[PDB]
UniProtKB/Swiss-Prot annotation, chain A:
Family: Belongs to the V-ATPase e1/e2 subunit family.
Chain's gene name: VMA9
Biological role: Subunit of the V0 complex of vacuolar(H+)-ATPase (V-ATPase), a multisubunit enzyme composed of a peripheral complex (V1) that hydrolyzes ATP and a membrane integral complex (V0) that translocates protons. V-ATPase is responsible for acidifying and maintaining the pH of intracellular compartments.
Subcellular location: Vacuole membrane
Membrane topology: Multi-pass membrane protein
GO molecular function: ATPase-coupled ion transmembrane transporter activity; proton-transporting ATPase activity, rotational mechanism
Any Gene Ontology CC annotation: proton-transporting V-type ATPase complex
Keyword Membrane (UniProt): yes
Keywords from the UniProt entry: Hydrogen ion transport, Ion transport, Membrane, Transmembrane, Transmembrane helix, Transport, Vacuole
Phylogenetic lineage: Eukaryota, Fungi, Dikarya, Ascomycota, Saccharomycotina
Cytoplasmic side: 21-31
Protein name: V-type proton ATPase subunit e
Keyword Transcription included in the entry's annotation: no
From Swiss-Prot, chain C:
Name by which UniProt lists this protein: V-type proton ATPase subunit a, vacuolar isoform
Subunit structure as annotated in this protein's UniProt entry: V-ATPase is a heteromultimeric enzyme composed of a peripheral catalytic V1 complex (components A to H) attached to an integral membrane V0 proton pore complex (components: a, c, c', c'', d, e, f and VOA1).
Gene behind the chain: VPH1
Post-translational modification comment from the UniProt entry: Glycosylated.
Additional comment: Present with 55714 molecules/cell in log phase SD medium.
Cellular compartment(s): Vacuole membrane
Residues of the full protein shown: 792 to 829 of 840
Job description of the protein: Subunit of the V0 complex of vacuolar(H+)-ATPase (V-ATPase), a multisubunit enzyme composed of a peripheral complex (V1) that hydrolyzes ATP and a membrane integral complex (V0) that translocates protons. V-ATPase is responsible for acidifying and maintaining the pH of intracellular compartments. Is present only in vacuolar V-ATPase complexes; enzymes containing this subunit have a 4-fold higher ratio of proton transport to ATP hydrolysis than complexes containing the Golgi/endosomal isoform and undergo reversible dissociation of V1 and V0 in response to glucose depletion.
From Swiss-Prot, chain D:
Classification of source organism: Eukaryota, Fungi, Dikarya, Ascomycota, Saccharomycotina
Gene that produces this protein: VPH1
Superkingdom: Eukaryota
Family, per entry: Belongs to the V-ATPase 116 kDa subunit family.
Subunit structure: V-ATPase is a heteromultimeric enzyme composed of a peripheral catalytic V1 complex (components A to H) attached to an integral membrane V0 proton pore complex (components: a, c, c', c'', d, e, f and VOA1).
Posttranslational modification: Glycosylated.
Transmembrane segments: 6-24, 25-40
Further facts: Present with 55714 molecules/cell in log phase SD medium.
Cellular localization per UniProt: Vacuole membrane
Protein known as: V-type proton ATPase subunit a, vacuolar isoform
Function description: Subunit of the V0 complex of vacuolar(H+)-ATPase (V-ATPase), a multisubunit enzyme composed of a peripheral complex (V1) that hydrolyzes ATP and a membrane integral complex (V0) that translocates protons. V-ATPase is responsible for acidifying and maintaining the pH of intracellular compartments. Is present only in vacuolar V-ATPase complexes; enzymes containing this subunit have a 4-fold higher ratio of proton transport to ATP hydrolysis than complexes containing the Golgi/endosomal isoform and undergo reversible dissociation of V1 and V0 in response to glucose depletion.
Swiss-Prot record, chains E, G:
Pfam families: ATP-synt_C
Organism: Saccharomyces cerevisiae (strain ATCC 204508 / S288c)
Topology Cytoplasmic: residue spans: 22-43, 103-114
Family: Belongs to the V-ATPase proteolipid subunit family.
Location relative to the cell: Vacuole membrane
Gene3D superfamilies for this protein: lithium bound rotor ring of v- atpase (1.20.120.610)
Name of the protein in question: V-type proton ATPase subunit c
SUPFAM superfamilies, sorted: F1F0 ATP synthase subunit C
Length: 57, 213, 31, 43, 148, 114, 148, 150, 150, 150, 149, 150, 150
């Protein structure tokens, strides 16, 4: 139901934030995909319909 | 009643901001309180159809303490400008500026003036000086003591303020050398009769509020 | 939207280690 | 701040734009105007 | 029953007037003491003379506070306001006049040893206003027990 | 989700910024703890009270949006859980807590005080 | 029941007077230390003297806070406002006098070193109003008893 | 009565934020004005704004602790000890910030001429910052008795 | 019930908009004078106007959040908790904006002569967001506890 | 019923008209003073009066929208949200006009000497318009909740 | 009640005070600018006539609000006209207060250079929208005051 | 019966006499200051005091007309009408006298400095009575319904 | 009845005596000699004291007529209609006394050097003294219908 299962299934089951990197700028390009995938997992559509009540009040 | 706790907190809050006004800047008076009281009094005065008025009976308190406190507070402030000028002269002259201390006794007479009326304004009692409208009638004698002591206190405070202002100018009495201080003392002596005549006329016009059994 | 840059430059710089990270972010992609 | 590899603020390039982008599709005009600066970077 | 603000107004007004008089006497004594160090003991009399006015408001506040909490009524709560206001205004005016009188007496005594006896005589004679308000406050506080 | 009115999207947008900032705070603490490499110390002990308070608040915030049926919380949950915590040690849950249920506040206060 | 404003007014007035005295001592402290850098530990006595007056209002508010019950009449919430207001006014006047006495004592003690006894004597003597108002507020708070 | 507790909880954080804002503004004015004459004293003169800005945590934590005990319905007994503790914490924070501001501006202005009075200004600010802590402790002691009812 | 709780939500935007307007006017007054001496320092000195005007989002978000919680019917205890958060956030944003105006004008005038003081002026002004964030968090916590049903 | 809800509709147009009048006067003073010494900046300096004069439409539209929601038969709880939203929109328009007046006068006076600060004065002058839009949006949100009761 | 007469009468007093202050500042600026060169006195008189036109909105709003008064005096007819008249009065007072500074700045700046008459006439002609907005708000508030009991 | 409209007769003559006295004092100050340099413009400058003094006739005629329309009974349809109707002409005469005094002082000093200013000052002073004429017309229209007290 | 209306007779000569005292006070101040002597303008300067006292002398008849029309017992109908005539003569006497005081001070200071301004200064106080006559006429017209009350 939650987006944490889709985010853990996508991020935790896709590449795992690894492992190869380029030979030039491997620090920014290596650590950029982990933070971008971490923020993209944080934007996983975790909105209402678990405790939501529309048209309030 | 609420008039006792409201008049006490308003009287303490007025003397607090009034005393802190001439002092160092730590607190200021509420300037919006006059427009708020004027707009609130004028708004509730017009609407609705009614006559606004407070109705106490005597209140028993402010006459004897207000007369002696108003007379002592007014008499105690007059010697500041005179003593600062008389000691402010210094070694400039051995003249009458060190022998004109008789005005300080005239300013000191304003402390007894009104305090003697407050001593005479209570006979064999300290909570109520006369009959009040709580168990008896005729509360006008206790009601008029507040206005009589306030008028005698304000008159003694104004006479002591005028005597102190005349004594401060009567301290030096000369802008140049070869001057006489008797001319300033002659006009300063004429302002001391306002406290005695205002205290006798104020105490005689107010009647008496003592001898309450 | 500079509150994230101010908070990340002030508060985020203390636990990690000024305007050195903003110049280092643009200079990182150049080199 | 003359370090060779670290530290110079390498995490600000990911944490900076990701946390800064959350305050704002309004991002389409910023993506178009930012995309015009790629071709307009030389001139 | 609102005699607590009237009882605290004596020590409040006496502490404010003694604080302002001790502040002005300490400022004038500290300013005039920089010239000659021998005039420090002569200039220190105005702060000690101004600071002695707190005993009347403390004793009147203790005497007015002693008659609160065991017996009280509607007519027995008005004398404390005028008794505290009298000693408070007398102590505040005596401290305010004692500050400028102590500064002018400190400058006159700092100029020569002639006006120090006059400033000490005026400062010693200025306590009658606080003594009259303390006697009026003790006289009004003494008659606070008539019925009940 | 979707924005239609107030008091509806704020319950998820409120905990979304805290849940997103918690990973940045934990990554910022692990990044500072990994650096400074014999010369270790002063970094492993830090980030324990905030990790326990923010971990118990983020755990109740993530568990609160999954709790329907009734074992959940409208006020907020998450905010009321960390807000009620740190004030009373002998509590049970306020609100929407799992079957633990009072050892989390005692372990959080005991680990935060040390 | 509204006696909490009288309990908070003692620490509010004592904190305001101690803050104004610490500001007045810190204003002349930099000017006195700017001329001579040797006197650095002989000018901080007015800050501790002004800060020592906060213990009277803090102990008065802490002692008055313990006497708060679930039920209380209107007679027990009147003397605390006058006692706390008198203690706050006495601590504010003592801090305001200790600020100008500390700045004048530091400015007078900066030029001549013999004037430190007058500035320490005036600042040590100006704290009697907070002890008198704290003692009157302690006696008025201890003499207040009422239930329902 | 309806409610009277929010006035002290709002006046506590309002007075603490106003005192910390006035002290931070007064310290930043003299620090920014004195920072042009001496570049090395910029790091030393910035201690008063950061030290003055930490005074809002007492009124914020006291307002959060007083706000945590107030829900939808409440009684009238909490709205006097809460207003008293919030007024005492607000007056203590405002007096601490107002006392810290003038000493921070005078210390930052006087620190440019002679760099030896920094320990006196830091000890004056550290000794003046306890006034808000005493009112925060009195507001915590008075706030501890406001959770028995409701 | 009277349902007069709109004054608490509407009270925040007046002090927040007045403080942000005074800070933006104080930064904009010194920004045009400091931009004449150096053209590159205009974009560096322009940050204090947005930093002073950024404090209006707390009062606007608190007023927008408290505006939808009113509805039609209300209780006797509803309307007092939002007044402390609105007045606290309004006075905190007004004092922070008022100190940020003089601090931004003095920081822009001091940073106009020397460009090295821009980091100290931005670092000194960057610490002023804690008061508005604490007051906005206290206003959000007070507004969250006002509505408990529906 | 009292029927006193018109004070909120009058206070918004009064505060917005006073802020727009003070902003138009402050912009016209610096524009008229700067127009004599430099006639090239006449068309450039006209942006501040047009930007400052647009604040009146928010209070006029809020008062016109609040006038329709008053009703022919007024109630006792009806004049609360219109008074809070009208006072918030009036204070936001007065603060926005007061900041726009000093920003327009400082922008015209600083832009009179050098024309390089026109981008910073235009961005700083355009950045202050969010207060009237936030207060007008809060007055519209409070006005939307004032038509369901009664 | 019966107290809406001061609110209905203050609308012309606010615009009359703002137009009086605008004519005072325009006469002060024309008097200060006429000393250096008496060739542009007729050009500087446009600000007093432009500022004096705002009184017609408060006068027509006061006459229209006074014409709608019934025979009884209650609390429902003394609240809408007070805010409606006070809105047009405060808007006319603010428009006259801005027209006074705009006419004084234009009349003072028109002495050294008459090139700013287009900008000062444009801002002074553009600053009259507050009286029409307050008059429209007073008419909208006055339109819902019918059926006075 | 109860009545409160008795102050409306003197309320117009008080503000009209105060504004006419202030305008006559402001015209006499400029006429006295300009009479020292040139004594030829004194008789020509004396006409503005008599022209400014005609504003009191509207308040006197409105006060006599309002006092003449008073019967033997007091109702709710006559009270409070002469206060606003006379107060409008009093405020219009006070603003017209206040602008006529400032216009008469600058017109007298500027007319004493350079000639040809008497046509402009007399034109503005003659054109300033339109607010008093409109206030007298509105005072007559409001005074026309002051009778017929039920 | 409450017997309200007796304060109107005593309040009539208050503003008239204060206006005449401010007129003679403002007229007596200033220097009137040039080197050793004057132009014999001391006989011309005595007219402003009589012109300031003429407003109090005309205002005393309204207080005498109101005091004679007051009586020992009166109802609220005649007392409400009787009160209000003294304030109209008092305000016009205070404004005319203030304008006669400023015109007597400027006409006395400028009249000390050259007596050519006495022609306009003498007609200014005569044209300004009509406010007390109009207020006394309105007080007589208002007091004419307050006699024989029941």
């Amino acid at each position: 139901y939650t987006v944490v299962g889709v985010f853990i299934v996508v991020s935790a089951m896709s590449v795992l934030f690894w492992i190869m990197a380029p030979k030039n700028n491997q620090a920014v390009w290596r650590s950029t995909v982990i933070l971008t995938l971490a923020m993209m997992f944080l934007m996983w559509a975790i909105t209402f319909l678990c405790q939501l009540h529309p048209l309030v009040a | 009643m609420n008039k006792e706790s409201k008049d006490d907190d308003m009287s303490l809050g007025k003397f607090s901001f009034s005393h802190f006004l001439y002092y160092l800047v730590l607190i200021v008076v509420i300037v919006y309180g006059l427009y708020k009281l004027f707009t609130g009094h004028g708004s509730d005065i017009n609407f609705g159809k009614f006559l606004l008025r407070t109705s106490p009976y005597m209140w028993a308190n402010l006459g004897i303490a207000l007369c002696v406190g108003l007379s002592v507070v007014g008499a105690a402030w007059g010697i500041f400008i005179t003593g600062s000028s008389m000691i402010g002269a210094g070694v400039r002259a051995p003249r009458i500026t060190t022998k004109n201390l008789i005005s300080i006794i005239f300013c000191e007479v304003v402390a007894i003036y009104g305090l003697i009326i407050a001593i005479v304004f209570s006979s064999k009692l300290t909570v109520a000086t006369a009959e009040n409208m709580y168990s008896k009638s005729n509360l006008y004698t206790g009601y008029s003591l507040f206005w009589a002591g306030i008028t005698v206190g304000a008159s003694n405070l104004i006479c002591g303020i005028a005597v102190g202002i005349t004594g401060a100018t009567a301290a030096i009495s000369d802008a140049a050398d070869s001057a006489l201080f008797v001319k300033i003392l002659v006009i300063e002596i004429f302002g001391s009769i306002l406290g005695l005549l205002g205290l006798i006329v104020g105490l005689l016009m107010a009647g008496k509020a003592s001898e309450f059994q | 939207s500079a509150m994230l840059h101010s908070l990340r430059l002030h508060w985020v710089e203390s636990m990690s280690k000024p305007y050195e990270p903003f110049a280092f972010e643009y200079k990182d992609m150049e080199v | 701040a003359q370090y060779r590899e670290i530290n110079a603020g390498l995490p600000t390039i990911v944490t900076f734009p990701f946390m800064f982008a959350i305050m704002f599709g309004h991002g389409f005009l910023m993506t178009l105007a930012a995309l015009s600066l790629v071709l307009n970077e030389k001139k | 029953f609102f005699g607590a603000i009237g009882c605290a107004s004596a020590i409040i007004f006496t502490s404010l007037g003694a604080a302002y008089g001790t502040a002005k006497s300490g400022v004038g004594i500290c300013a005039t003491c920089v010239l000659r160090p021998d005039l420090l003991f002569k200039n220190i009399v105005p702060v000690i003379m101004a600071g002695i006015i707190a005993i009347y408001g403390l004793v009147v506040s203790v005497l007015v506070c002693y008659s609160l909490g065991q017996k009280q009524a509607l007519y027995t709560g008005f004398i404390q306001l005028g008794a505290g206001l009298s000693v408070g205004l007398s102590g505040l005016a005596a401290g305010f006049a004692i500050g400028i009188v102590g500064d002018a007496g400190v400058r006159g005594s700092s100029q020569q040893p002639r006006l120090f006896v006059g400033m000490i005589l005026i400062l010693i004679f200025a306590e009658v206003l606080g003594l009259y308000g303390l006697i009026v406050a003790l006289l009004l506080n003494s008659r606070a027990t008539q019925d009940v | 989700g979707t924005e239609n009115a107030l008091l509806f999207s704020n319950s998820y947008k409120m905990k979304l910024s805290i849940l997103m900032g918690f990973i940045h705070m934990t990554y910022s603490y692990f990044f500072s703890l990994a650096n400074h490499l014999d010369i270790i110390g002063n970094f492993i002990p830090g980030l324990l009270f905030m990790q326990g308070i923010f971990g118990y608040l983020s755990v109740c915030i993530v568990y609160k949006w999954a709790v329907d049926w009734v074992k959940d919380g409208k006020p907020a949950p998450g905010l009321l859980n960390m807000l009620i915590n740190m004030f009373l040690s002998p509590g049970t849950i306020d609100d929407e807590l799992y079957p633990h249920q009072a050892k989390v506040q005692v372990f959080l206060l005991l680990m935060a005080l040390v």
